[PDB]
Symmetry: C3
Subunit: 117 residues, 3 copies
Amino acid sequence: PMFIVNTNVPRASVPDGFLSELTQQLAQATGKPPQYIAVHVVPDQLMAFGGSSEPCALCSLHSIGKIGGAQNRSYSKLLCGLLAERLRISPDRVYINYYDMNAANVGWNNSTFALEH
Amino acid sequence: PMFIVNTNVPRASVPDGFLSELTQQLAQATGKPPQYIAVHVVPDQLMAFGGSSEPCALCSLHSIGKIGGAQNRSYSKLLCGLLAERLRISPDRVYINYYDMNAANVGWNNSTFALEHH
Amino acid sequence: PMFIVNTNVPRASVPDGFLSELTQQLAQATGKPPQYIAVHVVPDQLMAFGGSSEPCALCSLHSIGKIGGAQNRSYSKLLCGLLAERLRISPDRVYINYYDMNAANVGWNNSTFA
């Protein structure tokens, strides 16, 4: 899985431990091994939510499977919770785009995750 | 909706009020309320288009619905026009990827926009 | 086509010629003319792969067609090869998301490719 957060929150406000907390909690939430979890945090961004430049975040989560109605709501509760607690961003100023990736459409280690045919 | 612009144009070349103009114009174009429009501009990027590092932009528009052939043609005229006028980027050096998002695949406010079923 | 690479490798470690090599090699790999290839490199990123901040890369390739099983494996061998040779990133610390874009969902030059 791949999780990206873009935010106008300053880099200085990103707490020690944040990438690791995201890695571990996403490994657990998605059921994928932590060795395969990638996280990417992009602070100090020029962005607005609703025309306001108060703290906000635009995120994406890509996973091969484990994407769907109830699962995505659980991911959103988890991730908004972390963004609120760690970055002081209001949950109603976060968007997370979820992508259910086909294994053939993910590159890794000189090939893809479609190794069957 | 979510609109992202990635460009090699300098930050100083991004006019004050650009994010607000994008918000208002996108609210008007999509019919979605401005309170729900998110805009993101990323200047000073290391990029090339056609092998050239002249001004260019790589953009995305995500929306739950309001995405389609004719609408996307309209969005493209609108957005290329704004990037040309405000950032001085030529329309033939802009790519805009459109994404029609399912409500269940957009997180917001501790949940998603799929609030109807369990 | 458009190719984006986000990496925690420092900007100074990106070699002269890198954007041009990507442009030209993707033009060849995808069969599309180089004048329509867009490339975007974002160094100095705060990221981790498997909980480690050793060199890694998160990438995307968007194309109208020319996306599929065998083709994507070929793109990945090409791109991981370039990332290893040029940026010293291990192939097993690279993810590349491939997107087969509908022509109606790609805007360019005031209209779309549809």
